[PDB]
Write a protein that binds this ligand. Structure first.
Ligand SMILES: Cc1cccc(-c2ccc(OCCCCCN3CCN(c4ccncc4)C3=O)cc2)c1
Ligand SMILES: Cc1cccc(-c2ccc(OCCCCCN3CCN(c4ccncc4)C3=O)cc2)c1
Ligand code: NA
Ligand code: NA
Ligand code: NA
Ligand code: NA
Ligand code: NA
Ligand code: NA
Lengths: 245, 58, 297, 242, 242, 99, 58, 49, 49, 48
């Protein structure tokens, strides 16, 4: 009655029989931009059902030695479906998201994934090891697209900050003995009313195993983690030709 | 006073009590802020709230 | 006009962001209420499900037998203004005589406060911040001596000509704001408004400032947001002839009327550069002290 | 002019003085402030949010740092064996330094309030067990055995559908506030010790791991407050930041 | 006397400080102010007045400077050929520097608002034609062809009794205000591009010039405002002015 | 040709949304633009010199010897105003002496 | 205060709000000006005004 | 600014001057004062013992 | 020119004239010249008792 | 990834042994005749 759940938006429906409730980041639901907060004058386009639906973009395999991964929003979707097209044809974009991370196993497996959302997740580099070289992460690392990217040093989140404090951000845990999924709703977060979906990633989705996956020889060893997400209250403005970056 | 409203906190849910001698409000002192707090925004951002007495997973 | 039902009943356009929580007044710590033994079934405060993502709701009263305590301890010192409205060093500018850096009697400093760890770590606790500020300029010789020297500080906003010398025409300062003051005088002090084109400055910007290919040579621009670049701080000794004394200008910032959004984990590795969160890969240290075993102090 | 007389303090620059200073840009109006989610009004809001407590703060090589985030439990010999221990002092070097509470704590000289640590079991669904978690107020030395620990404030945790349990470390002090405790005369402000013991045993059937881990999350209760603002003990910079 | 205490700022001279200073001529009364036409109260009044935009900013020899004030159109081969292009950034080096709007813009760090450019055809009465004028918001590269430009904000101009047409460059930004754009990270504040194409063709009968010119006049819309007063990028003096 | 600027607005050229513009027009008032002290005169009093080696000097009050200020006021044909004058003195090195 | 009216803006269509300690008003601060604007004086100084919808040359 | 004129005494430090000085810890609130026996209000109370 | 800084228990004590602790981002400090009058400040009752 | 772009359901095994996929009526015509290879594929319903 808090374990069972159904999420329906657009022409897509998700079900789960082992949930752990739903998190609504910073305590507020996504909303369209008000006439007082707005600044751009053109009438926006709000595609509704064709873009605010569930997209299942990627699957990773959880292994006894996995370090963890991250994805950037809206980067992950910029090249998928009608959402992607709208994000490419328009300069300005804004939306919220419903993120549903899936991972099931058996009552004999164990492990815990921390699923969190970190706004303005700026990536850093190891600075040449000694810290004397002022290196910078390449485009493929800051905006990894749908395949996401694996954390090199999860302890400091590849950005010099403790993962132990990541719980100060909207999050849920996927503790196999308890639940098989995480659901996080996120409102638009920025210091501007709209922004480029291409040049700016509003937040990052982190999936990091804090308690290692484990099981005995003979139990299914392939434990996938799948990422499904749905834009919410999408708005676009500043129309012109399509641009990929 | 009859000054400009150019303070970084103009229109905040927490009102301030400050001092100033110039026509621009941002020159004013920091003053006293209002003591409101909303811990739940971060500590309990759940949709369907769960009681203390009951077991969290019903 | 509208007619088909799905349109009439749609929520497309709702600008009222529904909020699940509201702030309540809390001038003092919460009190403790008397409690007694409870030997109940069904009732279980101690048990939780951290997976949900929420912190424990269990209180003292439900875990042990408590007395009544009237807590009048104040929560005033933990407000944003209380924590941040304390002047701290954010910039140091040298004006030596015989030197390698600024041996020309003037200097330009890009207004960026991330070159000092104490202040930086504090503000980086939040993602977005909006505030006014009070800046204080402390000048003296390298020994801390005070000398009869007149200086000019000029704020050069983006787009205004940066002086290229002690005699530059830009020092006419017909529109930019300038401060003329002597080292013998007390520190100069002024109030600065919130100047970003954005509704808030942001210590972290996960993106690029422009469109196009983001090749190796342009990666220096990842994380650069113009909205945080307020301009240049220019200083010069006021004369057409070189000053007789070597000078040092320390810049202190005291934020006021502060608002912050989105708390983040706090920096735990030494800072290396102003522009990024790069850390020394070969010296990743634990966040704190360590011990030999988990069963010993 | 009007008769005035300068008093001491004149010309001094107090970094915490809340004064009025001349505005550099007259008639300037700041960009309006739109709505942004997650506005925080008081640091105490953050102290009530649980963050991971590094009870297992022993591994130090980079490749093992993530191991500090969780400690283990496994089938024993049923002798009420000890599982782990740590001081409850939040603003002291040790496990608490990994938590946001501990870090924010470092910016204040004194604190007051009850604390809470929630333990989440991450073993398999088929694993069961009962643990005894105790809090020993000041004066009580590290409990030599479970029987001794049991005399203090404690909780007996039973594994089940509810993955976690909460140990409340109630405010039990002689003074209204405690300064940061450390070896020496300041140990006067110590909060106490927390010890974890096996009440029964970690039992598991055939086919399930004999070792599982527990993750500890800690935060402050609603009666917690801090005062006397100070600089943190760490300064994260070696040379100049360029 | 009365107990006072000097604070920092004491003795400093802030050029923008709006203070009170002693009057040198007591009881002096200024010459009365008669009525004079054309009083301006706010610089924004001037920004709404159209001035000539030097779209054709290529000729540089003194004898050809006047040619910058107008660009040409002439009979083509009907392939939707490109006529001219320019950035819409008003406070950026280029065509806009010839306009009063661009100059006044130079005294402010930030601006916000919609812009407008009115094009006046000065060909013969017998010349006709249709042009497509487009505005490409940020992110869109210089349109390679008319088909691409057509995807943005645009106007299709038809020559007739009404000599002119107005292209509105609507405010489409991510931020409430834009700082002056320039190559580099500040290109973040770029406004976009304006391109002019032949929709049909410049048609003319026997006896009329095969080439005519267009004059562009630009100004700001009523939602335009500027802020954060600064010194202009130019200083029109080399040595001392004697 | 009429001599007036275009009356066309955003609303009539494209489909616009509603925007509540609270951006202030305060900083573009005459006083805001001009009430900023700027250099308008420099006077030398050298010891051994060609100009004023006699310990005194006369300066005709004309502010047109400095480009920044001059260009600003020359935007208008007629101007009426009061003014605040500040005199900053020091040696050529910027040193302060008991004089 | 009861001072002289020797300010350069005495009798202006835009009233000011200023500060002063001397008997001569011109010593006063610049203060705040009133925000009135008349763009048409320069942008549309035509005798017979022409609508937006209609064609300017009837 | 406002016309003032410094009088003698200016800058002097009188050890018994009861003046106002800037607070170093803004918004700091002292530990509440519990009841303690034997509070003395005036030295004359002691002279009668 | 001198700098006086109040270092509460638990705050880093400067170990030199160039110590990073002098950034004084949170501790209260007073910068003043010997030529100036004596520095003066008000201190609250700060004990935990 | 391609299938995911259409109408779908994500089924999770549990106490509830079954799940229901609704194949909503999405046609150009009010009625469909029986579809078969050829011009009558015009009335095809789609793929699952
Ligand atoms: C009359 C005068 C003379 C000399 C200086 C000034 C002056 C100096 C600085 C002023 O700007 C203060 C800006 C404070 C915030 C600076 N920020 C905002 C965001 N930020 C930042 C840094 C690095 N990454 C991201 C953001 C910053 O470093 C205002 C006036 C004024
Ligand atoms: C007690 C004292 C000591 C020393 C100086 C002064 C003083 C100096 C100048 C004063 O005049 C200020 C005049 C400001 C406007 C000057 N104008 C008005 C018109 N104008 C101008 C220049 C070139 N071409 C046309 C007009 C100018 O240069 C008043 C008092 C007063
Ligand atoms: Na007198
Ligand atoms: Na001041
Ligand atoms: Na005066
Ligand atoms: Na004065
Ligand atoms: Na006296
Ligand atoms: Na004082």
């Amino acid at each position: 009655s808090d374990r069972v759940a159904q999420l329906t938006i657009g022409n897509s429906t998700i079900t789960t029989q082992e949930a752990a409730n739903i998190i609504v980041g910073y305590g507020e639901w996504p909303s369209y931009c008000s006439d007082s907060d707005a600044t751009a004058v053109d009438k926006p386009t709000r595609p509704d059902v064709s873009v605010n639906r569930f997209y299942t973009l990627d699957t990773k395999l959880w292994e006894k030695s996995s370090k963890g991964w991250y994805w950037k929003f809206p980067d992950v979707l910029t090249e998928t479906g009608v959402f992607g097209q709208n994000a490419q044809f328009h300069y300005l974009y804004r939306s919220g998201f419903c993120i549903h991370v899936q991972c099931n196993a058996s009552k004999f497996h164990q492990g815990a994934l921390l699923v969190a959302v970190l706004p303005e997740y700026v990536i850093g580099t190891v600075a040449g090891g000694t810290g004397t070289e002022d290196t910078h992460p390449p485009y493929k690392q800051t905006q990894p697209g749908a395949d996401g990217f694996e954390l090199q040093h999860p302890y400091v989140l590849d950005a010099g900050i403790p993962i132990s404090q990541l719980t100060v951000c909207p999050h849920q845990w996927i503790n196999l003995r308890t639940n098989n999924c995480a659901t996080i709703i996120v409102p638009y977060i920025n210091a501007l009313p709209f922004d480029s979906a291409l040049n700016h990633c509003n937040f990052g989705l982190l999936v990091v195993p804090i308690s290692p996956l484990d099981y005995d020889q003979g139990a299914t060893p392939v434990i996938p983690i799948t990422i499904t997400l749905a834009p919410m209250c999408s708005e676009f403005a500043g129309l012109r030709q399509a641009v990929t970056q | 006073s009859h000054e400009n409203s150019n303070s970084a906190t103009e229109g905040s849910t927490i009102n301030y009590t400050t001092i100033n001698y110039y026509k621009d409000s941002y020159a004013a002192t920091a003053g006293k802020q209002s003591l409101k707090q909303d811990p739940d925004k971060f500590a309990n951002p759940v949709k369907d709230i769960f009681t203390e007495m009951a077991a969290p997973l019903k | 006009g509208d007619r088909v039902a799905d349109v009439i009943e749609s929520s497309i356009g709702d600008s009222v962001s529904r909020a699940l929580t509201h702030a309540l007044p809390a001038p003092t710590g919460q009190n403790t209420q008397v409690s007694s033994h409870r030997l109940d079934t069904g009732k279980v405060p101690a048990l939780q499900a951290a997976e949900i993502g929420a912190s424990s709701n269990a209180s003292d009263e439900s875990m042990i037998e408590t007395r009544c305590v009237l807590n009048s301890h104040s929560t005033a010192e933990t407000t944003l203004d209380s924590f941040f409205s304390r002047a701290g060093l954010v910039g140091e500018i040298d004006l030596p005589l015989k030197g390698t850096t600024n041996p020309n009697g003037y200097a330009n400093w890009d207004i960026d406060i991330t070159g000092y760890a104490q202040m930086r770590r504090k503000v980086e606790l939040f993602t977005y911040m909006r505030f006014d500020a009070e800046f204080t300029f402390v000048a003296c010789t390298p020994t801390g001596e005070v000398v009869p020297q007149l200086l000019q500080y000029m704020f050069v906003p983006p787009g205004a000509p940066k002086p290229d010398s002690r005699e530059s025409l830009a020092w006419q300062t017909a529109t930019n704001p300038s401060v003329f003051v002597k080292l013998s005088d007390p520190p100069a002090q002024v109030s600065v408004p919130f100047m970003s084109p954005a509704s808030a400055y942001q210590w972290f910007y996960d993106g690029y400032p422009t469109f196009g290919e983001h090749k190796q040579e342009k990666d220096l621009e990842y994380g650069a947001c113009p909205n945080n670049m307020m301009g240049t701080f220019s200083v010069r000794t006021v004369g057409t002839s070189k000053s007789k004394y070597p000078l040092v200008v320390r810049i202190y910032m005291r934020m006021k009327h502060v608002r912050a959004w989105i708390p983040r984990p706090m920096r735990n590795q030494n800072y290396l550069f102003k522009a990024n969160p790069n850390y020394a890969g070969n010296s990743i240290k634990p966040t704190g002290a360590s011990r030999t075993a988990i069963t010993t102090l | 002019g009007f008769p005035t007389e300068l008093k001491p303090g004149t010309n001094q620059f107090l970094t915490t003085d809340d004064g009025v200073s001349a505005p550099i840009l007259p008639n300037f109006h700041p960009t309006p402030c739109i709505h942004i989610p997650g506005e925080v009004r008081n640091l105490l809001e953050l102290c009530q949010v649980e963050t991971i407590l590094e009870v297992n703060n022993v591994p130090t090589n980079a490749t093992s740092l993530m191991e500090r985030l969780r400690f283990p439990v496994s089938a024993q010999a049923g002798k009420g064996e000890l599982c782990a221990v740590f001081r409850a002092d939040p603003g002291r070097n040790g496990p608490w330094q990994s938590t946001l509470l501990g870090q924010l704590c470092g910016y204040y000289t004194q604190w007051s309030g009850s604390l809470e640590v929630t333990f989440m079991f991450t073993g398999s669904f088929m694993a069961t067990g009962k643990m005894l978690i105790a809090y020993t107020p000041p004066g009580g030395p590290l409990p030599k055995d479970r029987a001794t620990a049991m005399l203090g404030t404690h909780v007996i945790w039973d594994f089940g559908l509810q993955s976690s349990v909460t140990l409340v470390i109630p405010w039990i002090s002689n003074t209204h506030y405690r300064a940061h405790a450390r070896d020496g005369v300041f140990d006067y402000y110590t909060t106490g010790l927390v010890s974890i013991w096996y009440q029964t045993n970690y039992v598991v059937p055939i086919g399930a791991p004999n070792t599982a881990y527990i993750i500890a999350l800690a935060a402050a209760q609603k009666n917690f407050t801090m005062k006397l603002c100070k600089d943190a003990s760490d300064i994260l910079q070696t040379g100049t930041i360029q």
